[PDB]
Amino acid sequence: LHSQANLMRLKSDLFNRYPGPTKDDPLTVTLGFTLQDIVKADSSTNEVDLVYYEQQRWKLNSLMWDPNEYGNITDFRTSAADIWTPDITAYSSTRPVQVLSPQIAVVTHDGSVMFIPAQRLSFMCDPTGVDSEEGATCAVKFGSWVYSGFEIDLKTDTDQVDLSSYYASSKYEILSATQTRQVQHYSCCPEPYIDVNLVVKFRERR
Amino acid sequence: SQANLMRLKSDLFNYPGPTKDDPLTVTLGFTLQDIVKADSSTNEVDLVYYEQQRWKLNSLMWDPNEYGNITDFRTSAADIWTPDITAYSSTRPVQVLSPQIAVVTHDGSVMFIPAQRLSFMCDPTGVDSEEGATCAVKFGSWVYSGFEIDLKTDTDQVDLSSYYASSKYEILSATQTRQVQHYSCCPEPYIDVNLVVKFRERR
Amino acid sequence: LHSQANLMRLKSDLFNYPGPTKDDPLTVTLGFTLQDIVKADSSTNEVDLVYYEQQRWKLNSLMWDPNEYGNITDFRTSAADIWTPDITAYSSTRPVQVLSPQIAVVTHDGSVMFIPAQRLSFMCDPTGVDSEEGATCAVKFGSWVYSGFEIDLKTDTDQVDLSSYYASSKYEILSATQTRQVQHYSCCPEPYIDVNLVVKFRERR
Amino acid sequence: KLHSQANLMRLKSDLFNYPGPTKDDPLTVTLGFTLQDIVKADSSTNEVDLVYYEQQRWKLNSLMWDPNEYGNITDFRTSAADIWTPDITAYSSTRPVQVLSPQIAVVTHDGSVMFIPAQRLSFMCDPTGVDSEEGATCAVKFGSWVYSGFEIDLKTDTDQVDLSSYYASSKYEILSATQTRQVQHYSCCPEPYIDVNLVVKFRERR
Amino acid sequence: SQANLMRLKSDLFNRSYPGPTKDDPLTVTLGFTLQDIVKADSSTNEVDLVYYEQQRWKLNSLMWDPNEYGNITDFRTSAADIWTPDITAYSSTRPVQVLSPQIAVVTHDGSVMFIPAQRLSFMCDPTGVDSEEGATCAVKFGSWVYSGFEIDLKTDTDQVDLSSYYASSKYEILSATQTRQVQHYSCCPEPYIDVNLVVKFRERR
Ligand SMILES: CN1[C@@H](C[C@@H](O)c2ccccc2)CCC[C@H]1CC(=O)c1ccccc1
Ligand SMILES: CN1[C@@H](C[C@@H](O)c2ccccc2)CCC[C@H]1CC(=O)c1ccccc1
Ligand SMILES: CN1[C@@H](C[C@@H](O)c2ccccc2)CCC[C@H]1CC(=O)c1ccccc1
Ligand SMILES: CN1[C@@H](C[C@@H](O)c2ccccc2)CCC[C@H]1CC(=O)c1ccccc1
Ligand SMILES: CN1[C@@H](C[C@@H](O)c2ccccc2)CCC[C@H]1CC(=O)c1ccccc1
């Protein structure tokens, strides 16, 4: 019972009292993808639909505390709406992302945050060769829409997409799936933007 | 009578979810109402069902004698904490087919029974045979591990007593089973109730 | 401004109810006007209807004396500004699509009327629709969370209003009835009330 | 510049900080349709989809002001949500209307308001004969859902639907399109309701 | 540095913009980046595009001195925190779908840049797409409610940016131009400004 009034004393003290990153306050977001399924490939429009979850990690000094003086709370679940989250976007989506999981994140006492939204995405992809041995290869990069490498940097823990939850009876078998940090330039802006590029080769099952 | 109830609600409302120190057990039961569609071009199947959810909070307890012998009441689910029970292998956002209103009883227990339509990952191969198709989908808290939310069932049988009698697909069997599993994000295990459905096309 | 200010003052007073109970129960009267059977899907056994649903109920908490409020006898209000019953179609397969403005009318005796137009997909096997005998389907409506002890349902007629049915629909209506029923549900000991809409239809000749 | 926006921000504050029409204080709404396109005709469901915009004009004494007491301001743009708007609805839609334009109205100093939303509407319509020289004919009426002829009256400026912006390469050519005020009874209510009936004759382009 | 920023945004927002007037007009620069022609429907004559709409404008009310806010020169903010122009496609057939965060960048001289990604269905007869010559379609963009006297438009170039066009699209772009036009509409005596996007395209191979 005391435990609950310690948490709401913490949540109140952190929240009731962060404008996003700046070049003076740069931030690094670690990204990693777990591909659950390739649902559909449309060769009349060259759209492919993926189901996956995107693990996101970042850290802020604004959210730090000392467990010692909050009944030894080390972390808490909270709405993603109640905290700053990064605007990590797919570059070649052809439809708005459909969110498949609760929008709840976990804040740890070192100020570190973790969010793992599950999503359905339609993206630009030519499935030619998916009915052949070689299969088809498509790619899609993910990055902050409005924050350049000076404000938001990206990182991965591995270049292999997690395939351990891939749906074993999908219409499409995964032949490879990698995730790789890149740096590119864009017409709007002198400054470079960071992406993590998701490349997947796939073909029709047996 | 009415004054008692509007006093009770304002008293009870004016809980930050479960913690390791204060865990919660949620009881789950499924009632399968219809297998609407089986798509063999994308391997997706669409179900209409209820998700019975039961849990209990000390913070929602009261003495009926102090509130005109009121023992329970209806409230919007938005007025109370509800569990983030999610299908692991959905391919589209869940569509809610019923009012989201729960019932709280004086012992702090809550019952909530939403109707939903879910598209999930399922290969219907064999649905046009005697032996039918078989698919599974597991349900659980997205963000709470077994240390914060535990699950249980009262029965391993999915309720088929209202299943639509003229559906395109007849149900051969449907079971609900609690499992424990690990996920890459986290060292703590997460609990699920796995729904396994066997079905085929109607005569 | 004098009748305008009398209405501001009235809506203030009334709006500034925890739903029905066993002690303070409620009767909702329902009627359906079927405008169209839009689509029958025999690959999924789903049929789509367009109709409007007249709802009536009465709260003592919405009563006022017109003499105290400039002889105002009734007013239009947003459905969100008042309590509305949770009348739900039992066998829907998609969320209900609202086709009309969500505005109710409250009268000085506390009665309320609300008449939402809706597109509904519900579970229906349309087999026989291409024969002289036609197809037959049913969908029942009722409170999701209130039993017969908290909400009762009534109809004025068992005939669905077909006077606005689309004359050039793909589907011709052989009959349409609306019938009050009392039934038990697994969740609960106490029976719930429904109004059962039974439509009989065939492909246009 | 600064001053004229000081006066505008004043006016809006003063006007915004009306319960709809009553029998004692009824309102006349003028309606006019501009048909942009017949997008689709579905003879499997007898539904037709139109894109059009709906000109709405009405006048309120509560929105009246003196231009001379507010820096010679004679009108302003405002969010359609910041004011009362009429609940004009199609009687035979088969799907919720989709709004294709910003929801912004213009209020003039005499209390008059104009609002011209673009919409896509599916409504009940048997396209039988769209592939003949005579074409198909369909009708849909528009009116206040909850206000009778005692509360809201409807009028048109012309019985001709504006076809000057009809899409020249539509799948369907317009033979005629008219808008006509009618009076009718409905089961719910002893009071008659007003509608403007839009009658369109069309055929396949060839 | 955090403090200065949260001091600025606070200063700019909770202490003042009512949109443009005839007395205080605004010029918006528009540029399009065509990403993909996704679909061409010859049964309904609709074509779906994915594109950016680069928008620039400038407000005196959004100006500040960097020396009074720790030499801050710009900042990111949600599109909802500020006024944005109501730039609309004239001939869309469905509501626009937003594909990117709605976040803008404000600079100390009061200038704003906003680059939303969108998918649009618009009116387009794709006859000829299966030929060497291809199909031609056009769609104009402008303020829905502001005339040339309130909002003017300009382009930075006649060339639609094709440098990110999807290389394996079903349709290859033959040309794409963006041209400012002036037009009168039935509602209003004043002329309304548009930027007209004209795209020539054909099936790939
Ligand atoms: C750079 N950005 C790209 C998208 C890009 O962020 C991206 C890169 C990789 C993966 C996803 C998105 C497309 C056009 C929009 C711009 C960012 C942008 O919107 C902006 C706005 C105002 C000032 C400065 C920048
Ligand atoms: C564990 N979880 C699974 C979903 C899982 O909760 C589940 C299990 C069974 C049935 C449905 C969902 C997918 C990936 C996301 C993680 C949980 C998760 O989102 C999280 C976020 C921050 C900190 C700790 C955990
Ligand atoms: C009884 N009810 C039916 C729906 C039922 O209300 C109904 C009846 C006729 C027509 C439509 C709906 C489906 C399963 C859910 C339950 C109501 C229900 O959700 C509930 C929740 C907590 C305590 C007691 C009851
Ligand atoms: C009159 N109305 C018609 C629609 C009608 O307004 C209409 C007429 C022409 C074109 C469109 C709609 C359908 C059924 C609903 C009723 C009005 C209505 O909703 C109501 C509600 C409470 C009290 C009194 C009236
Ligand atoms: C002029 N306008 C056009 C749209 C037009 O702004 C446009 C032009 C080019 C490209 C897109 C939109 C269609 C009909 C609506 C009117 C503007 C309009 O809605 C209005 C409303 C009240 C008072 C004055 C004007």
Beta strands in chain C (DSSP E): 26-41, 46-63, 74-78, 87-89, 97-98, 103-107, 109-114, 117-123, 135-143, 151-154, 171-185, 188-203
Q: Which pair of structure tokens corresponds to residue D91?
A: 């009687």
Distance (angstroms) between ligand 2 centre and the Cα of A119 equals: 13
* d(C-alpha C156, C-alpha C32), whole Å: 11
Q: Count helices and strands (H / E) in chain A.
A: 1, 12
Query: Which residue owns the Cα nearest ligand 2 atom 24?
Result: B143
Rg of chain E over Cα atoms, rounded to whole angstroms, equals 19
CB A33 within 8 A of CB A53: yes
Task: DSSP for chain E, please give it.
Answer: -HHHHHHHHHHHHS-------SSS-EEEEEEEEEEEEEEEETTTTEEEEEEEEEEEEEEEEEE--GGGTTT--EEEEEGGGS----EEETTBSS--EE-S--EEEEETEEEEEE--EEEEEEE---TTTTSSS-EEEEEEEEESS--TTTEEEEES-SB-B-TT--TT-SEEEEEEEEEEEEEE-TT-SSEEEEEEEEEEEEE--
User: What's the rounded Cα separation, in Å, for the pair A188 and B10?
Assistant: 53
CB E102 within 8 Å of CB E34: no
What is d(CA E146, CA E131) in angstroms, rounded to the nearest whole number? 40
Q: How many CB atoms lie within 10 A of CB B147?
A: 15
Q: Report the alpha-carbon distance of residue E130 to residue E36 in Å, rounded.
A: 17
Q: Which helix (H) or strand (E) holds D172?
A: strand D172-186
Nearest to B161 among C21, C46, C186 (CB): C186
Q: Across the strands, what pairs with D27?
A: D152
Q: Is A99 in the pocket of ligand 2 (CB under 6 A)?
A: no
Q: How far is the CA of A146 from the centre of ligand 1 (A)?
A: 5
- Of B91, B123, B184, Cβ closest to residue A39: B91
Distance D185 CA to ligand 4 centre (A): 10
Using an 8 Å CB-CB cutoff, list residues of chain B that contact chain C.
Answer: 1-2, 5-6, 9, 31, 33-34, 36-37, 48, 52, 73-74, 95-99, 101, 103, 111, 113, 115, 117, 159, 161-162, 164, 166-168
The number of helix segments (H) and strand segments (E) in chain B equals 1, 12
**D82 phi and psi angles, rounded to 5 deg:** -80, -5
Experimental technique: X-ray
Q: Is C184 annotated as a binding residue?
A: yes
Does the beta carbon of D18 sit less than 6 angstroms from any atom of ligand 4? Answer: no
Alpha carbons within 13 A on the beta-carbon side of B46: 19
Q: Is D47 in the pocket of ligand 4 (CB under 6 A)?
A: no
CA distance E118 to E197: 15
Report residue D46: phi and psi, to 5°. Answer: 50, 60
Alpha carbons C200 and C47: distance in angstroms, whole number = 12
> Which residues neighbour B1 within 8 Å (Cβ) at sequence distance 6 or greater?
B68, C21, C23, C24
CA distance B61 to B52: 21
d(CA C30, CA C141): 9
Nearest CA in chain B to C87: B99
CA A48/CA A46 separation, integer angstroms: 7
CB-based burial of residue E37 (10 Å sphere; 0-12 exposed, 13-18 middle, 19+ buried)? Answer: buried
Residue of A nearest to E162 (CA): A187
A59 token code pair: 């850290």
Residue E188: count of CB within 10 angstroms of its CB: 13
- Find where tokens 């052809």 sit: A94
The rounded Å distance from CA C32 to ligand 4 centre is: 13
Interface of C with B (CB under 8 A): 17-19, 21, 23-24, 43-46, 86, 88, 91-95, 123-125, 144-146, 186-187
Ramachandran bin of D98, using left for φ above 0, alpha for ψ from -120 to 50, beta for the remaining angles: beta
Torsion of CA B32, B36, B38, B41, to 10 degrees: -140
Residue C12 one-letter amino acid = S
Q: Is the C-beta atom of A195 inside 6 A of ligand 1?
A: yes
Chain C residues contacting D via beta carbons under 8 Å:
3-4, 7-8, 11, 33, 35-36, 38-39, 50, 54, 72, 75-76, 97-101, 103, 105, 113, 115, 117, 119, 161, 163, 166, 168-170
Per the document, the length of chain A is 206
Q: Is D154 within 8 Å of D28 (Cβ atoms)? A: yes
Secondary structure (DSSP) of A156-198: -S-SBPB-TT--TT-SEEEEEEEEEEEEEEETTEEEEEEEEEE
The answer to whether A107 touches A165, Cβ cutoff 8 Å, is no
DSSP H stretches of helix in chain C: 2-15
Is C8 in contact with D19 (Cβ distance < 8 A)? yes
CA distances from B33 to B176, C97, C121, D32 (A): 15, 21, 14, 47
Record: contact E186-D9, CB cut-off 8 A: no
Cα–Cα dist B81/B58, whole Å: 13
- D6 Cβ contact partners less than 8 Å away, ≥ 6 residues apart: none
Q: Nearest-CA residue of chain B relative to C146? A: B74
Half-sphere exposure of C7 (CA within 13 A, CB side): 20
Kindly state the helix (H) or strand (E) to which residue B115 belongs, with its residue range.
strand B115-121
Write out the DSSP string of E17-32: -----SSS-EEEEEEE
Distance CA(B144)–CA(B19), nearest Å, equals 9
- For chains A and B, having 3+ Cβ pairs within 8 Å is answered yes
- CB–CB of B32/B118 below 8 Å? no
The 3-state secondary structure of E103-122, one letter per residue = EEEEECEEEEEECCEEEEEE
Residue type at A14?
L
Say if the Cβ atoms of B36 and C23 lie within 8 Å: no
**Residue D137 to residue B71: CA distance in whole angstroms:** 61
End-to-end distance of chain C based on CA atoms, in angstroms? 57
Q: Which two tokens stand for residue B127?
A: 């649905």
Structure-block tokens of residue E151: 């909002």
Terminal-to-terminal C-alpha distance of chain B: 55
- Cβ contact, residue pair E18, D40, below 8 Å: no
> What backbone phi and psi angles, to 5 degrees, belong to C69?
-130, 45
Is residue E118 left, alpha or beta, with left meaning phi > 0 and alpha meaning psi from -120 to 50?
beta
Strands B149-152 and B24-39: parallel
In the chain, the amino acid numbered B72 is D
Q: Could you give all domains of chain A from N- to C-terminal order, each with its CATH number? A: 1-206 (2.70.170.10)
Beta strands C74-78; A47-59: pairing state: unpaired
Q: A188, E54: Cβ pair inside 8 Å? A: yes
Residue of A nearest to E49 (CA): A94
CB B101 within 8 A of CB C144: yes
